[PDB]
Design an enzyme around this catalytic site. Structure first.
Site, PDB file in Angstrom:
ATOM      1  N   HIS A  89       0.820  -1.196   0.000  1.00 46.09           N
ATOM      2  CA  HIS A  89       0.000   0.000   0.000  1.00 46.09           C
ATOM      3  C   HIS A  89       0.861   1.255   0.000  1.00 46.09           C
ATOM      4  N   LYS A 148     -15.427  -5.108 -11.746  1.00 51.44           N
ATOM      5  CA  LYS A 148     -14.566  -5.861 -12.646  1.00 51.44           C
ATOM      6  C   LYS A 148     -14.167  -7.200 -12.024  1.00 51.44           C
ATOM      7  N   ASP A 149     -13.985  -7.242 -10.695  1.00 49.72           N
ATOM      8  CA  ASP A 149     -13.690  -8.470  -9.962  1.00 49.72           C
ATOM      9  C   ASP A 149     -14.860  -9.455 -10.033  1.00 49.72           C
ATOM     10  N   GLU A 191       0.620 -34.199  -5.724  1.00 46.83           N
ATOM     11  CA  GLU A 191      -0.418 -33.453  -6.403  1.00 46.83           C
ATOM     12  C   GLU A 191       0.184 -32.608  -7.521  1.00 46.83           C
ATOM     13  N   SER A 197      -0.531  -0.447  -6.380  1.00 49.50           N
ATOM     14  CA  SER A 197      -0.429  -1.408  -7.464  1.00 49.50           C
ATOM     15  C   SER A 197       0.449  -0.882  -8.587  1.00 49.50           C
TER      16      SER A 197
HETATM   17  C1  HEM Z   1      -3.097 -16.155  -0.450  1.00 44.43           C
HETATM   18  C2  HEM Z   1      -2.346 -15.762  -1.472  1.00 44.43           C
HETATM   19  C3  HEM Z   1      -2.400 -14.384  -1.963  1.00 44.43           C
HETATM   20  C4  HEM Z   1      -3.414 -13.452  -1.956  1.00 44.43           C
HETATM   21  C5  HEM Z   1      -4.822 -13.574  -1.396  1.00 44.43           C
HETATM   22  C6  HEM Z   1      -2.886 -12.292  -2.603  1.00 44.43           C
HETATM   23  C7  HEM Z   1      -3.656 -11.138  -2.812  1.00 44.43           C
HETATM   24  C8  HEM Z   1      -3.199 -10.021  -3.494  1.00 44.43           C
HETATM   25  C9  HEM Z   1      -4.004  -8.897  -3.825  1.00 44.43           C
HETATM   26  C10 HEM Z   1      -5.485  -8.743  -3.508  1.00 44.43           C
HETATM   27  C11 HEM Z   1      -3.183  -8.023  -4.478  1.00 44.43           C
HETATM   28  C12 HEM Z   1      -3.581  -6.681  -5.034  1.00 44.43           C
HETATM   29  C13 HEM Z   1      -4.346  -6.896  -6.364  1.00 44.43           C
HETATM   30  C14 HEM Z   1      -3.571  -7.654  -7.428  1.00 44.43           C
HETATM   31  O1  HEM Z   1      -2.526  -7.160  -7.928  1.00 44.43           O
HETATM   32  O2  HEM Z   1      -3.952  -8.777  -7.854  1.00 44.43           O
HETATM   33  C15 HEM Z   1      -1.882  -8.594  -4.582  1.00 44.43           C
HETATM   34  C16 HEM Z   1      -0.774  -7.965  -5.141  1.00 44.43           C
HETATM   35  C17 HEM Z   1       0.474  -8.597  -5.103  1.00 44.43           C
HETATM   36  N1  HEM Z   1       0.810  -9.827  -4.672  1.00 44.43           N
HETATM   37 FE1  HEM Z   1      -0.374 -11.113  -3.959  1.00 44.43          FE
HETATM   38  N2  HEM Z   1      -1.622 -12.517  -2.982  1.00 44.43           N
HETATM   39  C18 HEM Z   1      -1.260 -13.760  -2.619  1.00 44.43           C
HETATM   40  C19 HEM Z   1      -0.078 -14.457  -2.860  1.00 44.43           C
HETATM   41  C20 HEM Z   1       1.027 -13.835  -3.445  1.00 44.43           C
HETATM   42  C21 HEM Z   1       2.242 -14.446  -3.785  1.00 44.43           C
HETATM   43  C22 HEM Z   1       2.575 -15.911  -3.637  1.00 44.43           C
HETATM   44  C23 HEM Z   1       3.061 -13.432  -4.281  1.00 44.43           C
HETATM   45  C24 HEM Z   1       4.466 -13.496  -4.733  1.00 44.43           C
HETATM   46  C25 HEM Z   1       5.274 -14.544  -4.825  1.00 44.43           C
HETATM   47  C26 HEM Z   1       2.370 -12.203  -4.247  1.00 44.43           C
HETATM   48  C27 HEM Z   1       2.975 -11.025  -4.640  1.00 44.43           C
HETATM   49  C28 HEM Z   1       2.149  -9.939  -4.863  1.00 44.43           C
HETATM   50  C29 HEM Z   1       2.717  -8.722  -5.455  1.00 44.43           C
HETATM   51  C30 HEM Z   1       4.167  -8.429  -5.830  1.00 44.43           C
HETATM   52  C31 HEM Z   1       1.671  -7.896  -5.596  1.00 44.43           C
HETATM   53  C32 HEM Z   1       1.744  -6.503  -6.166  1.00 44.43           C
HETATM   54  C33 HEM Z   1       1.518  -6.658  -7.666  1.00 44.43           C
HETATM   55  C34 HEM Z   1       1.103  -5.362  -8.293  1.00 44.43           C
HETATM   56  O3  HEM Z   1      -0.031  -4.822  -8.079  1.00 44.43           O
HETATM   57  O4  HEM Z   1       1.911  -4.865  -9.083  1.00 44.43           O
HETATM   58  N3  HEM Z   1       1.133 -12.500  -3.760  1.00 44.43           N
HETATM   59  N4  HEM Z   1      -1.907  -9.831  -3.952  1.00 44.43           N
HETATM   60  C1  HEM Z   2      -5.301 -22.543   2.205  1.00 40.38           C
HETATM   61  C2  HEM Z   2      -6.303 -23.223   2.737  1.00 40.38           C
HETATM   62  C3  HEM Z   2      -6.386 -24.677   2.558  1.00 40.38           C
HETATM   63  C4  HEM Z   2      -5.854 -25.512   1.607  1.00 40.38           C
HETATM   64  C5  HEM Z   2      -5.045 -25.145   0.384  1.00 40.38           C
HETATM   65  C6  HEM Z   2      -6.257 -26.827   1.992  1.00 40.38           C
HETATM   66  C7  HEM Z   2      -5.933 -27.967   1.254  1.00 40.38           C
HETATM   67  C8  HEM Z   2      -6.413 -29.228   1.580  1.00 40.38           C
HETATM   68  C9  HEM Z   2      -6.204 -30.383   0.801  1.00 40.38           C
HETATM   69  C10 HEM Z   2      -5.440 -30.458  -0.490  1.00 40.38           C
HETATM   70  C11 HEM Z   2      -6.815 -31.416   1.419  1.00 40.38           C
HETATM   71  C12 HEM Z   2      -6.846 -32.819   0.861  1.00 40.38           C
HETATM   72  C13 HEM Z   2      -8.243 -32.910   0.215  1.00 40.38           C
HETATM   73  C14 HEM Z   2      -8.732 -34.249  -0.274  1.00 40.38           C
HETATM   74  O1  HEM Z   2      -8.196 -34.721  -1.305  1.00 40.38           O
HETATM   75  O2  HEM Z   2      -9.690 -34.847   0.288  1.00 40.38           O
HETATM   76  C15 HEM Z   2      -7.450 -30.922   2.595  1.00 40.38           C
HETATM   77  C16 HEM Z   2      -8.127 -31.732   3.481  1.00 40.38           C
HETATM   78  C17 HEM Z   2      -8.633 -31.178   4.641  1.00 40.38           C
HETATM   79  N1  HEM Z   2      -8.615 -29.872   5.034  1.00 40.38           N
HETATM   80 FE1  HEM Z   2      -7.817 -28.418   4.116  1.00 40.38          FE
HETATM   81  N2  HEM Z   2      -6.976 -26.777   3.122  1.00 40.38           N
HETATM   82  C18 HEM Z   2      -7.071 -25.518   3.530  1.00 40.38           C
HETATM   83  C19 HEM Z   2      -7.702 -24.981   4.644  1.00 40.38           C
HETATM   84  C20 HEM Z   2      -8.300 -25.763   5.623  1.00 40.38           C
HETATM   85  C21 HEM Z   2      -8.794 -25.263   6.844  1.00 40.38           C
HETATM   86  C22 HEM Z   2      -8.796 -23.830   7.352  1.00 40.38           C
HETATM   87  C23 HEM Z   2      -9.315 -26.312   7.532  1.00 40.38           C
HETATM   88  C24 HEM Z   2      -9.885 -26.126   8.880  1.00 40.38           C
HETATM   89  C25 HEM Z   2      -9.794 -27.214   9.603  1.00 40.38           C
HETATM   90  C26 HEM Z   2      -9.100 -27.476   6.726  1.00 40.38           C
HETATM   91  C27 HEM Z   2      -9.494 -28.729   7.045  1.00 40.38           C
HETATM   92  C28 HEM Z   2      -9.263 -29.825   6.218  1.00 40.38           C
HETATM   93  C29 HEM Z   2      -9.734 -31.175   6.616  1.00 40.38           C
HETATM   94  C30 HEM Z   2     -10.499 -31.560   7.873  1.00 40.38           C
HETATM   95  C31 HEM Z   2      -9.342 -32.011   5.625  1.00 40.38           C
HETATM   96  C32 HEM Z   2      -9.540 -33.509   5.561  1.00 40.38           C
HETATM   97  C33 HEM Z   2     -10.881 -33.968   5.020  1.00 40.38           C
HETATM   98  C34 HEM Z   2     -10.724 -34.078   3.523  1.00 40.38           C
HETATM   99  O3  HEM Z   2      -9.777 -34.664   2.935  1.00 40.38           O
HETATM  100  O4  HEM Z   2     -11.582 -33.523   2.837  1.00 40.38           O
HETATM  101  N3  HEM Z   2      -8.493 -27.091   5.567  1.00 40.38           N
HETATM  102  N4  HEM Z   2      -7.165 -29.574   2.669  1.00 40.38           N
HETATM  103  C1  LIG Z   3      -8.566  -5.862   2.675  1.00 43.08           C
HETATM  104  C2  LIG Z   3      -9.791  -5.988   3.570  1.00 43.08           C
HETATM  105  C3  LIG Z   3     -10.271  -4.665   4.179  1.00 43.08           C
HETATM  106  C4  LIG Z   3      -9.799  -4.467   5.616  1.00 43.08           C
HETATM  107  C5  LIG Z   3      -8.600  -3.521   5.660  1.00 43.08           C
HETATM  108  C6  LIG Z   3      -7.315  -4.315   5.715  1.00 43.08           C
HETATM  109  C7  LIG Z   3      -6.781  -4.168   7.123  1.00 43.08           C
HETATM  110  C8  LIG Z   3      -5.417  -3.521   7.021  1.00 43.08           C
HETATM  111  C9  LIG Z   3      -5.560  -2.104   7.530  1.00 43.08           C
HETATM  112  C10 LIG Z   3      -4.522  -1.782   8.596  1.00 43.08           C
HETATM  113  C11 LIG Z   3      -3.180  -1.380   8.001  1.00 43.08           C
HETATM  114  C12 LIG Z   3      -2.981   0.118   8.113  1.00 43.08           C
HETATM  115  O1  LIG Z   3      -3.530   0.643   6.913  1.00 43.08           O
HETATM  116  C13 LIG Z   3      -3.226   2.007   6.710  1.00 43.08           C
HETATM  117  O2  LIG Z   3      -4.377   2.757   7.080  1.00 43.08           O
HETATM  118  C14 LIG Z   3      -4.349   4.158   6.793  1.00 43.08           C
HETATM  119  C15 LIG Z   3      -5.718   4.670   7.208  1.00 43.08           C
HETATM  120  O3  LIG Z   3      -6.634   3.578   7.430  1.00 43.08           O
HETATM  121  C16 LIG Z   3      -4.004   4.412   5.312  1.00 43.08           C
HETATM  122  O4  LIG Z   3      -3.786   5.801   5.094  1.00 43.08           O
HETATM  123  C17 LIG Z   3      -4.280   6.307   3.843  1.00 43.08           C
HETATM  124  O5  LIG Z   3      -5.641   6.719   3.943  1.00 43.08           O
HETATM  125  C18 LIG Z   3      -5.986   7.821   4.802  1.00 43.08           C
HETATM  126  C19 LIG Z   3      -7.446   8.182   4.487  1.00 43.08           C
HETATM  127  O6  LIG Z   3      -8.134   7.092   3.843  1.00 43.08           O
HETATM  128  C20 LIG Z   3      -5.020   9.027   4.716  1.00 43.08           C
HETATM  129  O7  LIG Z   3      -4.965   9.693   5.986  1.00 43.08           O
HETATM  130  C21 LIG Z   3      -3.564   8.666   4.368  1.00 43.08           C
HETATM  131  O8  LIG Z   3      -2.890   9.825   3.857  1.00 43.08           O
HETATM  132  C22 LIG Z   3      -3.410   7.481   3.402  1.00 43.08           C
HETATM  133  O9  LIG Z   3      -2.058   7.017   3.349  1.00 43.08           O
HETATM  134  C23 LIG Z   3      -2.726   3.654   4.932  1.00 43.08           C
HETATM  135  O10 LIG Z   3      -2.386   3.844   3.553  1.00 43.08           O
HETATM  136  C24 LIG Z   3      -2.889   2.174   5.233  1.00 43.08           C
HETATM  137  O11 LIG Z   3      -1.656   1.497   5.029  1.00 43.08           O
END
Ligand code: HEM
Ligand code: HEM
Ligand SMILES: CCCCCCCCCCCCO[C@@H]1O[C@H](CO)[C@@H](O[C@H]2O[C@H](CO)[C@@H](O)[C@H](O)[C@H]2O)[C@H](O)[C@H]1O
Ligand SMILES: CCCCCCCCCCCCCCCCCC(=O)OC[C@H](COP(=O)([O-])OCC(O)COP(=O)([O-])OC[C@@H](COC(=O)CCCCCCCCCCCCCCCCC)OC(=O)CCCCCCCCCCCCCCCCC)OC(=O)CCCCCCCCCCCCCCCCC
Ligand SMILES: CCCCCCCCCCCCCCCCCC(=O)OC[C@H](COP(=O)([O-])OCC[N+](C)(C)C)OC(=O)CCCCCCCCCCCCCCCCC
Ligand SMILES: CCCCCCCCCCCCCCCCCC(=O)OC[C@H](COP(=O)([O-])OCC[N+](C)(C)C)OC(=O)CCCCCCCCCCCCCCCCC
Ligand SMILES: CCCCCCCCCCCCCCCCCCCC(=O)O[C@H](COC(=O)CCCCCCCCCCCCCC)COP(=O)(O)OCCN
Ligand SMILES: CCCCCCCCCCCCCCCCCCCC(=O)O[C@H](COC(=O)CCCCCCCCCCCCCC)COP(=O)(O)OCCN
Ligand SMILES: CCCCCCCCCCCCCC(=O)OC[C@H](COP(=O)([O-])O)OC(=O)CCCCCCCCCCCCC
Ligand SMILES: CCCCCCCCCCCCO[C@@H]1O[C@H](CO)[C@@H](O[C@H]2O[C@H](CO)[C@@H](O)[C@H](O)[C@H]2O)[C@H](O)[C@H]1O
Ligand SMILES: CCCCCCCCCCC1=C(C)C(=O)C(OC)=C(OC)C1=O
Lengths: 383, 75, 54, 56, 124, 85
Positions: free
Chosen positions: A202, A228-229, A272, A206
């Protein structure tokens, strides 16, 4: 002043999802971030639900998964949703990482969100690995065995660590119960790091497909990127639907419907699909410790992209040679994936080694050279 | 008479030079010792640490050579 | 005192090294001391005290 | 005086020392839960006949 | 890589007759295929600016150059989001692709690099 | 490197007039058919080589490797397999 700005809590939400200033030209590859958030939410909902019906004890685990499939109302759906979303999570994360590498999202000033990102990727791998073991089918048991023995490569204490991670002398009940507890925990850790990488981002905002500043032309996150999302959310849900309802087992291994048997080793043990490239890299090195180092290095090497990319320009939109190199890198990563699931036979052995060399030479040789040359071509070419 | 001041540029990288770094070499040494003592202390309980490292230390090493009588061991 | 300060305390690297080495010594000696004390206050009661009959 | 400072660093150092020793004890005892439990260690012996087993 | 590096290396190539004979035509085709001119950019518009050095160089641009750069960035962003290319006068002609920023960044860097050197001087 | 609304960190802007019309005043799908055909063709044509070249090369490599592997494990490939191992 508007309440959304005045109130500190509302203002934090506001700063991320509403007033957040975005570039006005993000393309559809910027939609994987929200898809990853969607996968994480689906996994939390389905995962916590499965935990209400699953038993972690080795005598009951496989059967508890059958009970979920057969007796629990919509248990089949919750199970298949959880299992397939784990695959979609990796499709989206590879797309997101692909976007980041192509568009130079790892360059200053975004080194920190990228580096935290690399850790998120490691946490996803560990989460998914442990979850797969929980079924306690044949692939589960042997998957755990082999992967938990990569720690044996660590010199001196390595074997002691393996027994410590097993809670005995082989993968068994202690291992299964500990993997349940850690599988439950890891997604929460992962969500925290996902939040951290956004907070780190932030400060710069982006990046965008042109690689220039967007400070000149900003759009509110809502309503433009909200709506758009939604398009990609519904495209995702269509893909989800086709797998979950019409082909729920396409991405899986039949051997995981056989209960774990410590005696019989299955004909072919592959991970996998999403882990397959790293497994191919490991096979490429004949040495045990060599192989483990290479496999880990294949992920940690992402941390040096900020250094080895010597370009004065961010991203590949305007770099024809870099675009060709990127294409070869991505296709090689897919070939490694394929080679991860072939038999250890000629001629795939040598091919795997060539592809492994190409993988590493991208970071160490080609990207530094190509980026240097393109710098010079931009300057001379525009004189 | 002096026409120009007399100086050279020492080699440097990321804002470090050898004169400076050389002053810190001993400090890295002591930090290494601190990390060594700390690490070894953390794994003092690990039986391999006792068997391979700690029991071999002269005089002191007998602290870690302790046997359970066969009469008192179910396993 | 100056000497002691200059060697063990002045540099934090040295101070932390000294603290950790002391912790190691304390840990080992305190273990032994408590073991002996515990055995004296609970004398004749523990298995080690009756084991010889069997 | 150096003696004056040294005293207060002795107190700080002692505190750091007991905190280090206490953390080490805590970590070691706590993590040991993950090592094989007593029942796992009890499994150790199996007798097999040899009369039944043919050559080759 | 620093602009200084890029400029110095380029000058070594342009000096060598052989080298320039083989590199200059390649560089011109590279630039044609790059296609930044089709979004109405000048080459210098693409240089990463999120660094102290580049922020200082941009602050030193003459106001007119600075206003024109802002417009080219906004215009290119609009082409980007619309998935269109520039047409007509919006296309950057090779004669318009002037290195307006290179002098400023070379001066900023000159000082920054001299400062690093002089921070490491040793009285002889 | 990014500020906030009112102080985003843009260099001073002057001399640009921006115009647009209401979403209710516009046809959202104006020129959709032309875009869907001609615009997509142009955009695809310009990127085609960057996809075709690496995909085709790695598919060829795979095809050769998989065909050899298949052949080595036939009767005909006995001798070549023996050498390969
Ligand atoms: C749970 C997995 C992740 C979530 C939910 C997540 C979510 C996000 C979101 C919402 C943004 C801002 C919107 C976008 O650019 O798509 C973002 C930006 C970014 N993420 Fe992730 N991310 C994840 C994993 C990763 C991983 C594995 C990497 C890198 C190895 C990564 C690197 C970045 C970078 C560099 C940006 C900034 C890109 C840009 O806007 O230019 N993230 N991510
Ligand atoms: C990033 C989030 C997660 C990933 C990527 C993930 C991935 C997986 C995978 C690959 C399996 C094997 C599935 C199958 O072939 O049956 C599995 C099983 C399982 N996961 Fe997760 N998991 C996630 C989050 C969670 C969370 C938060 C829970 C909370 C308990 C959970 C509970 C389980 C349980 C109970 C199973 C075994 C039952 C089953 O195989 O369906 N998982 N998960
Ligand atoms: C993604 C799901 C939504 C929940 C929010 C995610 C939780 C993370 C928030 C806590 C991290 C601190 O987040 C921080 O907050 C302040 C104000 O809120 C932001 O501050 C920004 O907005 C405010 C007004 O909107 C301005 O005063 C400031 O000049 C600007 O930088 C920072 O840019 C951000 O980095
Ligand atoms: C998973 C869950 C499902 C959710 C779906 C998410 C996928 C969406 C996405 O990111 O991709 C769509 C994405 C469309 O995104 P966009 O916002 O129109 O343009 C992004 C690029 O700038 C588009 O680049 P461009 O403008 O240069 O156009 C190129 C594109 C044409 O782009 C399209 O409009 C299609 O065509 C190709 O590159 C095809 C390759 C040639 C092979 C023959 O399509 C592609 O870009 C595909 C090309 C990738 C190679
Ligand atoms: C398969 C090989 C893919 C090579 C891509 C080459 C560029 C191209 O044609 O793509 C179209 C577009 C080109 O878009 P662009 O943004 O460069 O150009 C837009 C149009 N102009 C130039 C006029 C401004 O590229 C993308 O959108 C690339 C996104 C990369 C995602 C890759 C995912 C792979 C996962 C592996 C992870 C490890
Ligand atoms: C729980 C872990 C305890 C580790 C103890 C290791 C030594 C650190 C310590 O006690 O603090 C000393 C040091 C410094 O304490 P200090 O800041 O009073 O000492 C600085 C001044 N000199 C070096 C001149 C004495 O603490 C730290 O550096 C932070 C570690 C906290 C523990
Ligand atoms: C899944 C289901 C989709 C969302 C359901 C909401 C119904 C949408 C119709 C309601 C609507 O259009 O009104 C807007 C509400 O949208 C909103 O307020 C939300 C806009 C879109 C929500 C989705 C945001 C991103 C989705 C991606 C997921 C993110 C990852 C986390 C899992 C008001 O808004 P307006 O400003 O247009 O009103 C203009 C006048 N008042
Ligand atoms: C979680 C709960 C935290 C509360 C700690 C209370 C004691 C728990 C440890 C077990 C214990 O009784 O340790 C004794 C020593 O006491 C001690 O020295 C421990 C008291 C120290 C209290 C605070 C120190 C750190 C606590 C939390 C830090 C955690 C971070 C690192 C794990 C016995 O000694 P032993 O013979 O069993 O020891 C083995 C090496 N000789
Ligand atoms: C166990 C806990 C470990 C804590 C270790 C701390 C070690 C840090 C040493 C350090 O800061 O060295 C600085 C020195 C360069 O000096 P300067 O540029 O800071 O003047 O840097 C170089 O010489 C390189
Ligand atoms: C995050 C740091 C990671 C590195 C730390 C590694 C810790 C993993 C387990 C530590 C090893 C445990 O190793 C073992 O610990 C127990 C617990 O004190 C010790 O056991 C000793 O004290 C316990 C009580 O504390 C008594 O019941 C026992 O009679 C005595 O032998 C053993 O002497 C030691 O062999
Ligand atoms: C930095 C590395 C992150 C952890 C990666 C672990 C998951 C992929 C490991 C590979 C693997 C190995 C090594 C392997 O040998 C094996 O074959 C039997 C597999 O199937 C269980 C595997 O999955």
């Amino acid at each position: 002043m508007a309440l959304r700005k005045k109130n500190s809590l509302l203002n934090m939400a506001n700063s991320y999802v509403l007033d957040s200033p975005q570039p006005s030209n993000l393309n559809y590859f910027w939609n994987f971030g929200s898809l990853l958030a969607l996968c994480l939410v689906i996994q939390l909902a389905t995962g916590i639900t499965l935990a209400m019906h699953y038993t972690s004890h080795a005598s009951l685990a496989f059967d508890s998964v059958e009970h979920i499939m057969r007796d629990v109302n919509f248990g089949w759906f919750i199970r298949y949703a959880h299992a397939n979303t784990a695959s979609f999570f990796f499709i989206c994360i590879y797309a997101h990482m692909g976007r980041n590498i192509y568009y130079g999202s790892y360059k200053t000033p975004r080194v920190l969100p990228w580096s935290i990102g690399v850790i998120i990727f490691l946490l996803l791998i560990i989460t998914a690995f442990m979850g797969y073991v929980l079924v306690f089918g044949q692939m589960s048991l042997w998957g755990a065995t082999v992967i938990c023995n990569l720690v044996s490569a660590i010199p001196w204490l390595g074997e002691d660590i393996v027994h410590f991670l097993w809670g005995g002398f082989s993968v068994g009940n202690p291992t299964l119960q500990r993997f349940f507890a850690l599988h439950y925990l890891m997604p929460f850790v992962l969500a925290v790091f996902a939040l951290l990488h956004l907070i780190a981002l932030h400060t710069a905002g982006s990046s965008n497909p042109l690689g220039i500043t967007s400070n000149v032309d900003k759009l509110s996150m809502h309503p433009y990127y909200s709506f758009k999302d939604l398009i990609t959310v519904f495209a995702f849900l269509l893909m989800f639907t086709l797998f979950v309802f019409f082909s729920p087992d396409k991405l899986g291994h039949p051997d995981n419907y056989i209960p774990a048997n410590p005696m019989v080793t299955p004909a072919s043990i592959v991970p996998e699909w999403y882990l397959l490239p790293f497994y191919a890299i490991l096979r490429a090195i004949p040495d045990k410790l060599g192989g483990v180092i290479a496999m880990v290095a294949a992920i940690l090497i992402l941390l040096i992209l900020p250094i080895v990319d010597r370009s004065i320009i961010r991203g590949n939109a305007f770099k024809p040679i870099s675009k060709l190199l990127f294409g070869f890198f991505i296709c090689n990563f897919l070939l490694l994936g394929v080679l991860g699931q072939v038999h250890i036979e000629p001629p795939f052995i040598v091919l795997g080694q060539i592809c492994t060399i190409f993988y590493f030479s991208y970071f160490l040789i080609l990207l530094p050279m190509v980026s240097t040359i393109e710098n010079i071509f931009f300057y001379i070419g525009s004189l | 008479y002096v026409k120009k001041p007399s100086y050279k540029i020492v080699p440097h990288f990321l804002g470090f030079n050898i004169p400076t770094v050389s002053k810190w070499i001993p400090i890295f040494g002591i930090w290494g010792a601190a990390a060594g003592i700390g690490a070894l202390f953390l794994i003092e309980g690990v039986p391999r640490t006792r068997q391979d490292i700690l029991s071999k230390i002269p005089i002191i090493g007998e602290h870690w050579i302790r046997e359970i009588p066969a009469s008192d061991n179910p396993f | 005192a100056t000497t002691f300060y200059n060697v063990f305390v002045k540099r934090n690297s040295a101070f932390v090294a000294t603290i950790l080495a002391s912790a190691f010594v304390f840990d080992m000696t305190f273990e032994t001391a408590i073991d002996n004390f515990w055995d004296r206050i609970n004398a004749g009661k523990q298995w080690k005290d009756i084991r010889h009959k069997y | 005086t150096d003696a004056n400072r040294l005293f207060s660093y002795f107190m700080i150092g002692s505190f750091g020392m007991l905190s280090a020793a206490g953390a080490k004890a805590t970590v070691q005892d706590f993590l040991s839960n993950m090592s094989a439990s007593a029942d796992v260690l009890a499994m150790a012996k199996v007798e097999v006949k040899l009369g039944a087993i043919p050559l080759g | 890589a620093s602009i200084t590096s890029v400029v110095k290396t380029s000058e070594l190539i342009l000096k060598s007759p052989l080298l320039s004979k083989i590199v200059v035509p390649l560089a011109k085709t590279y630039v044609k295929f790059s296609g930044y001119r089709q979004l109405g950019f000048k080459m210098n518009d693409l240089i990463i600016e999120e660094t102290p050095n580049m922020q200082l160089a941009l602050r030193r641009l003459p106001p007119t150059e600075s206003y024109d750069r802002v417009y080219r960035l906004i215009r290119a962003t609009q082409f980007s989001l619309s998935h269109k290319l520039a047409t007509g006068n919006d296309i950057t002609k090779p004669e318009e692709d002037d290195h307006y920023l290179i002098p400023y960044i070379l001066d900023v860097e000159a000082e920054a690099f001299e400062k690093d050197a002089l921070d490491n001087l040793e009285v002889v | 490197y990014m500020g906030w609304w009112g102080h985003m960190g843009s260099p001073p802007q002057k001399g640009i007039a921006g115009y647009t019309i209401s979403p209710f005043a516009a046809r959202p799908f104006a020129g959709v058919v032309h875009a869907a055909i001609f615009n997509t063709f142009r955009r695809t044509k310009n990127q085609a080589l960057f996809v075709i070249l690496p995909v085709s090369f790695f598919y060829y490599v795979w095809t050769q490797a998989s065909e050899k592997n298949e052949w080595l494990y036939t009767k005909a490939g006995r001798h070549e397999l023996a050498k390969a191992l």
